[PDB]
Amino acid sequence: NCTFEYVSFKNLREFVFKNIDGYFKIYSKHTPINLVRDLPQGFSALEPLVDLPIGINITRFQTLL
Amino acid sequence: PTYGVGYQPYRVVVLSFELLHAPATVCGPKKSTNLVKNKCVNFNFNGLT
Ligand SMILES: *[C@@H]1O[C@H](CO)[C@@H](O)[C@H](O)[C@H]1NC(C)=O
């Protein structure tokens, strides 16, 4: 059934997903890179994208590609 | 249209309110005041009193 809905190598796109007291939180960052086979050694902090009141529980996930 | 009022049509809307462990997706609108700078005041910004 239908529900809530919303609308908003060369690079590294880094993300964090977490679910707390009925809210789903997404954080991200983008950077240039000069390494292919691993995460590049250094530091930068992921900024919040969205904070969504969805109430849903999660135990599994998968990527779309 | 010639019917007496007990027989005439009425439209009805029943507004039902639900509250659970899941967060509030609906709220009544919250009004805001004008802004006073350079004076001592009570304040509230986004619920920060
Ligand atoms: C999420 O799981 C808890 C039990 O851990 C349950 O009480 C709650 O109703 C569930 N929420 C939904 C939207 O199914």
Side-chain angles (χ1 to χ4, degrees), chain A residues 55-57, chain B residues 21-22:
Chain A
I56 283 156
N57 294 309
Chain B
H21 302 283

Side-chain angles (χ1 to χ4, degrees), chain B residues 31-36 41-45:
Chain B
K31 299 298 187 177
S32 297
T33 66
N34 201 358
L35 177 71
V36 190
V41 285
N42 290 322
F43 61 77
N44 180 346
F45 293 83

Side-chain angles (χ1 to χ4, degrees), chain B residues 1-29 31-49:
Chain B
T2 194
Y3 280 179
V5 67
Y7 306 90
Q8 286 178 15
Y10 271 60
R11 283 171 183 214
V12 184
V13 176
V14 187
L15 300 180
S16 318
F17 309 140
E18 172 169 74
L19 182 66
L20 298 174
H21 302 283
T25 75
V26 180
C27 287
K31 299 298 187 177
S32 297
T33 66
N34 201 358
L35 177 71
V36 190
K37 288 169 175 169
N38 303 302
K39 293 185 181 176
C40 172
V41 285
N42 290 322
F43 61 77
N44 180 346
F45 293 83
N46 297 347
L48 179 61
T49 59

